[PDB]
Structures are given as structure tokens and as C-alpha cells.
Ligand binder design. Sequence first.
Ligand SMILES: Nc1ncnc2c1ncn2[C@@H]1O[C@H](COP(=O)(O)OP(=O)(O)OP(=O)(O)O)[C@@H](O)[C@H]1O
Ligand SMILES: Nc1ncnc2c1ncn2[C@@H]1O[C@H](COP(=O)(O)OP(=O)(O)O)[C@@H](O)[C@H]1O
Ligand SMILES: [Mg+2]
Lengths: 910, 454
Amino acid sequence: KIIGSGKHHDQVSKFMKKMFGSIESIIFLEDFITGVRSVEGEVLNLNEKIELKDSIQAQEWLNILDTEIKLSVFTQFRDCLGQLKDGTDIEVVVSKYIFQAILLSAQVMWTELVEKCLQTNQFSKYWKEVDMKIKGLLDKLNKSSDNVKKKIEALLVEYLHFNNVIGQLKNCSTKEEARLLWAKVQKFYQKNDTLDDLNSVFISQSGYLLQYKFEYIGIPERLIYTPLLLIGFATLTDSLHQKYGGCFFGPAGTGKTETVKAFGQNLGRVVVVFNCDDSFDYQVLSRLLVGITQIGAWGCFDEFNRLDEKVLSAVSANIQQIQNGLQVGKSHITLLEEETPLSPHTAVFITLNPGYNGRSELPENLKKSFREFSMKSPQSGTIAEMILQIMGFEDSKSLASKIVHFLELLSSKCSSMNHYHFGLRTLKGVLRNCSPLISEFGEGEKTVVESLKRVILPSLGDTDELVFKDELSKIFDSAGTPLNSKAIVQCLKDAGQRSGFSMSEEFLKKCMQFYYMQKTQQALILVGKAGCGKTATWKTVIDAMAIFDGHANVVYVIDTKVLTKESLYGSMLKATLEWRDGLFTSILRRVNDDITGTFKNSRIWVVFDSDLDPEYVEAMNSVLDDNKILTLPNGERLPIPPNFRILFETDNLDHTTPATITRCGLLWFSTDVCSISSKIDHLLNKSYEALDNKLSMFELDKLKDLISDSFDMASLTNIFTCSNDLVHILGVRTFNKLETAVQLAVHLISSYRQWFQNLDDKSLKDVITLLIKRSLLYALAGDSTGESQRAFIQTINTYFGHDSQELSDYSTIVIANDKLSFSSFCSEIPSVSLEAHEVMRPDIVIPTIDTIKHEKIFYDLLNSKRGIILCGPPGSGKTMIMNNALRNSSLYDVVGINFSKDTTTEHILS
Amino acid sequence: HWFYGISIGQFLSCFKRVFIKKSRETRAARTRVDEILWLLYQEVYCQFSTALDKKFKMIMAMTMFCLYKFDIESEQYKEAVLTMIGVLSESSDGVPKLTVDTNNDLRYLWDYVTTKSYISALNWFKNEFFVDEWNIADVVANSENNYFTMASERDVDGTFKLIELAKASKESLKIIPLGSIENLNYAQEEISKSKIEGGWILLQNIQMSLSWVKTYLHKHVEETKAAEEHEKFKMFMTCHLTGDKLPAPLLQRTDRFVYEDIPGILDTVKDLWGSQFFTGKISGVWSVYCTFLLSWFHALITARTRLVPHGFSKKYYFNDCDFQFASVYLENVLATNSTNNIPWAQVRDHIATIVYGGKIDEEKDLEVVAKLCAHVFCGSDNLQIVPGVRIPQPLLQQSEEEERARLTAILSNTIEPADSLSSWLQLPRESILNYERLQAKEVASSTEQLLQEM
Ligand SMILES: Nc1ncnc2c1ncn2[C@@H]1O[C@H](COP(=O)(O)OP(=O)(O)OP(=O)(O)O)[C@@H](O)[C@H]1O
Ligand SMILES: Nc1ncnc2c1ncn2[C@@H]1O[C@H](COP(=O)(O)OP(=O)(O)O)[C@@H](O)[C@H]1O
Ligand SMILES: [Mg+2]
């Protein structure tokens, strides 16, 4: 395509990202090349414009541009260094030169000044000067544009490294210790008396020198400088001095590849990263290796420990060839069945992840040419202080020490739990949530306290909350208060009492915690046993925010485990080469692509309302991370807008990885949000509003008054406590049987509304009480043996009043159209006779008292519009009783599905 | 283990030798059948123990002694030794049924085991075979094969032993290291011409070229049965027990044995110090002194590596690459800096963390390396690395050759005490006793489990 693009010369800019790795486009002029621009967005202006005639090949002018960009970077560096040496403000020079040039100029100036400072041992003055520079950069960051903000942040990272080193040098007691510390720190120098400008600047660490190749790097994600990072740099430069390659091994997520890339950036190189175990072809890798050898770039094998055995052997042979050529000093090595030149600036790095067997090591042929090093997670205190210094926090050292001490204290005192993770990741999450809170309250200790109470506190259990509170009081001297209280609390109360929910202290506490957590977090997890109120909590908060802000809400409730990964994320027809959307990506595209609907002024919620497993979430881990992009296995890479928020409603995290818990805002429901006599009232109101559409006014008011005052929690609390004494098959706690009790009671009451108008008040109350007793018995003790059912009947007749009509084992309201009395009866015992030829049909049943009672209760449960579960030993007669109850009626048709050891979800649909 | 494979043919050849070996009239075992059985046991242990490492050598010796004495001796001996192995293993405990004046050698074994001298107790069974273990001289001379595999761990290489043998065995050992495709082609040409010229050839570190051996060497050695009809040449292979699994037919075709010879600390110091000046001096006197100290430190760290979990919680093979990198750093720091000793403080922190502490992934082992470096390098005009030697700092005239001679003399003057692993190293003697008890427990458990099966 490039070869055929020798006339327009504008199709190369698409592949500039691939062939340069750092620059995304070439900024053109009407017939000249006026510069380049990187992926982050930054105009590098070439000093000498490149003419582009039509006859010139793409190869020739690309070749001249390759040197021109490096010469331009050196020119920017030289101009910036002189201006900085003159004494220009870092603020006035940021706007002129690219990030790399100002970075290198700063580093060289800092090294030069601190050398003489170490000679004279007067560190306080330069430390104060650097601190003032950092404060100036910090205040200029607030007034920065979209492009300059990244550059300012990177310069802040490097300047805080400078100040850290100067402070450590100042604290050193002896000159020997100061020089020991200065040896490890990566120093920068330039030769003022040399030709070949591109080789003027070099880097000295531990006495080893490395040339600075001036390849443009852009404005990359700078890593925070920590004493464990500089040890990685020292190991890499020690390996590179002796021409050995560079191997890192350690736990995943310790930034091995990022450390290699940061080392490359400091040296001015862009590191070509070969990603492994991504169905990575070998031939393309061999081509990349030949390119690395010929150019001289640094190639890093990310996750090298995961490769096919034959592919691993082939690539190890190639790497050994390259390394042998480098060590010997020979040129024109033999690989790819070809002799190719080998530039002596080539280098190979490898990062090995821990496998299933534990530790992973290099192949045998590479162990004699690679110097392995073990990477570890950084110390919490050092980078805690560094991040607090990234923000404008005062007393950042004391704050970081207090935060780390509090976290360790919590880990030592709080009760052990699966999701209790107080490592470095929790610290970084606390700081990231503390970052946006700076707008509301300043950069004091109370901001950290509020972030801790908004991150750690919700995820803690009930017994550990008091520990959190008292340790927070006794560690942090000041305990703050939250703002924006009255308005959102009143709005939550409105949105809850509108839906019937009871605004208890616990429910309001959980709603407030969820609201504050979703204020900043994007991925939410709600954990708690079935019936705690996760759905009620988040629905109430959604309604409250809709009423408060005025933004509309769009909710997509998806059950993850019902749908396979192909349906949830997207399926590709490998035999026909079409990609299908799936469910999650379809509703993401409907958000990004469409604008006619209310999608910019509305908050999108995707509630994964099912148990989560690592396999499902690893396909969206990029969404959970700071990337905030959904990376499909093939297709467009979808950006999630700020309104798009993912919630996870589950009941356990026994299979969710620590990474997902740390990234996602976790809200743990340690107890039910409402008491028994609040769920009962909510269900009563939800049934009254359903009956309201098919009933008169006064009759309904009187009936609901009778239902409400007929039972009281004083008598029912003893019943609910006694129900736990009974043995329950397929046990479910009574807080979940309340729904069945209330719904069945209300339906039974409503089914006899015709016989209530001409009914006396006393008999009406007796009817309501008897039906309530029946519903309570068949909901609480409905899954008992049958003798324990009689025991529960005695309990019911004891704890209710002694005047209401007693409930017997067969007490049923039978109503005759010729009489007005309720006429409650029991124990009919009918009789039936059948012929010989009817002895076995799938619909012949001998009616006994047990059969009639079971059929009656089953039909009453069906008419209550609630699902039923008949649990019993084989041959007991569950199917027979259903089919008899539904054969008599002309309203229901039975569809019998027979589940087996594995009935897929499409069996039911079929 | 993938290396201890045994075939019916080898066993039958070993038994054939039992009759065809009129060395010396052994103990008078009455009937000829008993004497043949004893000779069979002796020959099996003498031949098939070379292919095993030290722990499995002990296991074989104990198990075969038990198998022989469960038939030759009485029940008062059988239950005695069964309970004896139960005592040696830490799984069971009790007193054996010691019959006085009837089982004397068992009483010597009881004296050994009560004194908690596990190594002598385990070597008692080897001593009871009254046979001298075959060295590589015996194996190379006696076995009528042209192929031998020399396995070992990654800490010790027996290439020097094979060189010394072949220089004294009829001609020209020829080392052919593997590696890149150049090494592979050079090796194939060398072997193709050496099977005709007859010189002994060696193939260092087969493992790295596994894919090559699976394709070239495997079918070659399986098909070159006319090599015995070629000139009398011997092709050797060096592998690693912890390395990758060699193909089964290739290993079965060739003879095998395990090189188990760990040199003493002083021996390693002497070898390293001798080898350092063979390549010639690089810098002045202080470079020589620092190279001597580095040799001492490398020997100490390598010696402590073998012990586990006492000393190092794992096994970190400190090869010669670490020594080379540390030597390069020492030359650099003594070149850029001055003659004075001031930068010792940064000689440690680089050696203890970057070159020798890079592989380390646990904090305890890093602390071990750091304290070892602090002990070895921090010195003021008189350094006592081990309680038996004192190293004075260089002279004032700075005569480098005299300094090298003096260091050689101070190496030759001292001798290694038998308790060096507790005195020369910093870990206590009780640690060594616990380690020996653990290894004896492993041996006893394995042999009891084998006895359960047989
Ligand atoms: N504040 C409240 N006052 C009264 N009743 C409430 C309150 N909150 C919840 N409930 C009752 O508790 C029920 C819990 O329903 P919800 O769907 O929220 O449960 P959950 O714990 O998330 O469980 P699931 O795993 O079944 O989704 C509600 O349907 C309602 O009947
Ligand atoms: N009252 C009854 N009248 C007639 N048959 C009964 C009665 N009680 C139990 N049975 C017998 O019990 C068996 C239960 O069958 P089925 O309903 O298939 O078991 P399940 O409900 O466990 O699937 C029936 O075959 C029926 O013949
Ligand atoms: Mg729910």
C-alpha cells in the first residue's frame, strides 16, 4: 500500500504509528512536511522542511525524515537546555518545547547543579529552589489545556524525583553515604567538546555509561520514581554494559514491561514490545526481530513465559543468535535463513510471568546470555508519599505515613475476610478517589479521611465498622463531616417513600454509601446474601439522583451467567468472517453511536444482576482499569462515556479475583436493610396498589384497614422466631418467606370480595384472620414434614388472639351462593368409584384429605401469581397433584419440561 | 526420575557378569546358590548405583541390604532392622528387639543411630556390601559401549574429571560445546569425522540443544550401530538432572551415570583463584586483592547454596556469570575511584543486591546475601573471612606479583576443618544436624515405602 502510495504520500501516516511506535501522524504542508504528531497529541516541528516531489519514492523521504525527527528533537533539547541554564521559568519554557526535550534539559541541568551542590554539601538552597519549581508547576497544572496537562504531569513526576533525591542527599550524614546514594541515582551528562551532536548526551549510573539516542518518544505515561524502580534501572544497565540481555521475572502486575519502557524512555528510545500468547504468529515475530536487529531498537518480549513449545524454541534460538552476535561484536548475523547486518545498539529484554507451576525461568540456551532479576511490588510508604506530593497535599510525608500505618493497623485488627484487601492497590484506590474530592474540600487531612470513609468503610463488615471508626479517630487527629447532606437525604427519602420502601437508619446508610461511591467510581459491586436489598438500594439511589439532578436514567439489567460469552460480549463467525455484536457491545454502541435519544443528559446503568466469575470479567478488565475502553477480540474498541456505569449485583466473591475487587467500588451488605415489620408493610402496600385498579374506594379502605389491624408484629414476632425452630426442607430464611405470606394472604382476602358487602363485621374479621393464619402457615411452615405443620398450627393458634376463629389442619372457607354466612368447614372425605379400564391413565387420582389439601394450597399459590416449588421424595405425588389441580381448571395449560444433569437454557425455549 | 530408567537387557548383562567375573573368592556362603545370590547383589549395586545420585545411592544400598537380610538372617534380625528403619524415619519411634551377643553389627548401627550420626548410619549399609563403588574410570573402561551421559546438578560440572581421565586414557578428549547453529554444525562435522578418527568427543550441555538432539543426535545414535565397527571412539554427553527431560530411547541406548562430587570451600577458593590469573592481570594490586575477596565470597555463597532450607530457603544456582559480572564491577569501581578503600560501602550494596541478589525473590535470602557481603567486604587492615584465616591488606610499594604469591601462600597454609559448614559458614551446627536428620528421614521413608511394595 505504501509502495502504491508514492504519489499522494498521505497514506503513510496511517502506518506511521506501526513503523515508528510513538508518532501517530505526519503533519503536512501544501507540498512540504511541516512536522509530526504523536499518539498523545503533540506537534514536533522539523527545523528543515522536507520537499516531496511526485517522483520521489516513499522509502527515500521516509529515510530522510527518520533522521530529521531525531535532529529536531536534539535541536529542541539544545535550545531548551540553554534557556533553562539562562534561568528561564520552567513555566515559560513548557509552552515552547516538546516534553522529551524539556525533560532531558531539566535532567541534565539538575545533574549539573547537584554535582556542584554535592561538592559543596549545601543542599538546602537547591532543595528549596526545586520545591518552588514544583509548586509553580503544580499551580500551572490547574490552568493547563488538554495537551499541556499531560506534559505538566510528567514534568511533575520527574521533578518530584529530583526533589526526593536532593532531600535524601541532604539527610545523608557523611559524604561517603551521599556519594553512595548518588551512584545509584541515574545521572545525566553531556559532552560540550564533541562532534556528532546526537551522541553528546549520555547517562551514568553505577559508573556505567549509556548513550542517549534522540528518538522521539512523545508524552508517555511516566512511572513514579521509587527506590525499587532505580534498582531495576541499575540491573538493566548492568546487564547492558556487558552486552547481556535483560530479563525480569516476578508476579503479574509489578510493571516489568512498564519498567523496561520507562528505562527506554529515559534513554530516549521507544521500546518495541512483542506481546506473547496472543495467538502471535512466529513469522511476523521473525520479521520484527530482523527489523530490530537492523534498526538498533530495544525489543521487549512481554509475558514471554507463555508460548507454544516449538514457537518458544524457535524464538529462543533467534534471540540467542542475536545475543551471541551482540556479545562477540560480529556483524551480519544469520537468521531467517538470511545474513543480515546487526547494529551494535540492539538489545533484547524479556519479562516472565509466574505460571501454574509457580516460578517460570528462561530456556536453557538463554540462561547463559540473560541476567535475570526479580521484580517486587514497591514499598507502600514511598510511593504513597510520592502520590500525595503529586497532588497539592501539605505534610505529604506525615499523611502518607499515617495512611500506611492505618492500613496496616486495619489489616492487623479487622476480622479476616475474603474481600478484605489492604495492600498497595487499596492505597492507590484511596488516593484516586481522593483526587476528585479536592474540588469540594481542600488538600488537608480531612480529604484523606473522607476518601477513606468512602472507599474502605462500605466494604467493611458490621463488626469491623466500629474498629474502622475508632482507629480513624485515634490515628487521624481530625474527623471530618460530609457535605451535600440535606438535599440528597430528602430526595432519597422522597424516592423511597414513593416506592413504599422504609427509610430506616440502615437502608439510608447503605443508600448514602452507594451514592457517594458512585459519585466517583465507575464499576460498582454490591455483595450480600439473597434478600438484603441490593436491588432496592441501587434502584432507590437511581431514582433519588434522577429526581435531584434531573438527568434521565437508562437501566439494562443483564444476567451474566445465563448468557454465554459469545452472547454477552460478541460472537465471530470464523468460517464466514462476520463479527456479531452480542448484548453488552450492542447497548454500548447504542450509547456511543446514537445521539437522537436522551443519551448525553442521561446516566446509563448496566446492572449485571448475577454471580460474577473471573472468565466473564476478564473480557472487560480493560473497562475496569483506567483505560475505560472495551477491547473486543475483533472489531472496534469501544469507549465508555462517563455516564456509562457498570454495577455488579451478587451475593459472594469466593471466585472473584483480588484485582477486580480492588478496581471496583465494593459495597458489602452485612445485614438486612429493613426489619420484618417494614418488609411486611412494603409488600402490603404493593399488593394494595395492585388491588386498587379493580376495586371500589370505601370497600378497599375498609378491607385494607382490617388487613392491617388484623395482625400486629407483637404476636407475629413470636411466630417468626418459632418458625426457625421447625426443620425446613430446602431451607429459606423467613425474611424471604414474608413475600409469599403477604401475597397469599392478600390474594385470599381479595378472592372473596363479593361475600364481604353483606357480611357482619365480626364474621368479616374472623374470615380475614383465618385466611391470614392459613397464608402464614403455608408460607412459613409450608415446607415442613406435615406433623411439624400441625405443631406450627398449634403455635399459630397460640400466639394470635384467643377470640379469632381457630385454624385447624383442614379449616377452609366454603361459600354457598344460597347462604350469606362464611360457613367454614373441614374434613370432607369425598368418595369415588372407577371402572376397570380406567385403572391407569395419566390423569386418574384417588382423592384423599392430603390430596385435596395439597391441591387447594397449590391452586391458591398459583392464583397468587407466584412460582411454586414442590419438594418431596420420588413417587410422593408432586406431578400427580399438580396435574389434578390443573386438569380440573380451564384456565391453565401445563408444559412439562424434565430437567436432567444438564439441560441448557435453549431446551426451555424449545 | 527421568534419568534412572533401567532395562531388562542391562540387568541381564549385569547378571551375566556375576558368573563371568573370577575376581576373588568371596565369603564362604555354604551352598553355591547363596554365593551366586550375594554376587548378584554386589554386581547390581556396583553397576547400577553409578546411574543414581547420592540420595538414591543410599536408598538403593539400604533397600537391597534389607532385601538380602530378610532372607539370609533370622526374624530377630528382620524385625530389629524394620524397627530400626522406623527409628531412623521420624514417622515412628521405639526400641528394637536387640538380642545381645547375637547381632553385633546391628549393635554398632544402634550406637551410630543413638549418637545421632545419620550420615554414618546410612553409610553403614554401603559398607556392608564390602565393594568399592565404581568411579568413572571403572565405568568407562569396563562397559563395552561408546556412549555415556554425565548427569549432575547445575552446581558442579565434571568436565575437568573427564578431561583428566581421557588425558590419562589413550588420547585427546575433545570438548564440543553446543549453542548457536554454528556450534550445531561444528558439532555434527566433529562427530562425523571423530567416529572415523576415533578421538573421544564430549558434548557439553546437551539440554539447551534439546530440539536438535530430538532430531539429529537421537536417530543418529540409534542408527550408527556400525560406530562400534568404526574406530574405538567414545562419545560423551553432559546433562543436568534438574534440566529438561531427554528422550527415553536415546538415554536407554547410551550408558548413564551421575557425577556427585562437591568440592570443599577451600578447594573452590583455590580453583577460582588459580583460574583468575590464567587469563592475565587487568589492573593493579587492589584489583588483585578484590578479586581474591570476590573468589572467597563466591565460594562461600556457592557452598551455602547447597544446604536447604537451612542457609537459603531455596536453591539458587550461582554460576560463573555472577562472578564475571561482580569482577567487572570491581574493576570498574577500582578504576574510576582511587587507590583508597572508601567505596567498600558501595561494593557491597551493588554485589549484594544487583549481581548476586537479582535472582533472589525472598527477603530472608536477600538478608543472607547482604550479611555475607557485609562480612566479606567490610575490613580494616585485617580480615577474618573464616575463623582460621586472616587476610592482610596490600603493601605500600604495591608489588602485584608478590601480592598474588602471598595470597596463594595464605590459601595453601590453611586447611579446612571437618566442621567447616558450621564454622566457615555462619549457620550453627544444630542447623546442620537438623538438615542431616531431614535427609536421613527422607531416605528411611522412601526405603520403607519401597519395602511395603516389595
Ligand atoms: N427499605 C425497605 N423497606 C421495606 N422493605 C424493603 C426495603 N428494602 C427492601 N425491602 C424488601 O426486600 C426485598 C429485597 O429485594 P431485592 O431485589 O432488593 O433483594 P436482593 O437482596 O438484592 O436480592 P436478589 O439477589 O434476589 O436480587 C424487596 O423486594 C422488598 O420487598
Ligand atoms: N391419592 C392417590 N391416588 C392415586 N395414586 C396415587 C395417590 N398417591 C400416590 N399415588 C401414586 O404415586 C405415584 C406418584 O407419581 P408421580 O406424580 O409421577 O411422582 P412425582 O410427583 O414424585 O413425580 C403415582 O404413580 C400414583 O399412582
Ligand atoms: Mg436484587
